[PDB]
Design a protein around this ligand. Structure first.
Ligand code: HEM
Ligand SMILES: [C-]#N
Length: 124
């Protein structure tokens, strides 16, 4: 049932779009992460992140973006992207969801789903 996904329960599109917007305002202010995004079109990147999060939170049928591993392979191989950056990024999202008032159980579910992206991203 549409209402029963994590996506729907956390407030659906308005909630995910707001979370992604705040998430990237924190990331571009973070000296440890901002250099990775300094020449990225952040309007397009926000849209891509909304689409990905919507998919893994159960809000869309089938992801139409690029494979996560392929999308970050160049960053890991040539720009020093590493597991510590992943932890920093995850913590920005957790703090964002907390600030936006996401219920603790839903925040835990969302963040476990983000944790599941780690092997995908690093090709482990
Ligand atoms: C923590 C979970 C993460 C998720 C869910 C995630 C998800 C995504 C998605 C969906 C895209 C767009 C791919 C596309 O369709 O083109 C992307 C691109 C990108 N990601 Fe991540 N990512 C994560 C971690 C990171 C980390 C740790 C870094 C570096 C600190 C990072 C840096 C980037 C950059 C710079 C791009 C844009 C690359 C480009 O277009 O040139 N991501 N990510
Ligand atoms: C990756 N954002």
């Amino acid at each position: 049932a549409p209402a029963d996904s994590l996506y729907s329960r956390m407030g659906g599109e308005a909630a995910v779009e707001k979370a992604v917007d705040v998430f990237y305002e924190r990331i571009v202010a973070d000296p440890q992460l901002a250099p990775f995004f300094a020449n990225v079109d952040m309007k397009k990147q926000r849209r891509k992140q909304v689409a990905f999060m919507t998919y893994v939170f159960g809000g869309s049928g089938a992801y139409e973006g690029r494979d996560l591993g392929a999308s970050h392979r160049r960053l890991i191989r040539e720009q020093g992207m590493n597991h510590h950056h992943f932890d920093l990024v995850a913590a920005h999202l957790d703090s964002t969801l907390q600030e936006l008032g996401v219920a603790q159980e839903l925040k835990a579910e969302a963040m476990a789903i983000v944790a599941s992206a780690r092997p995908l991203i690093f090709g482990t």
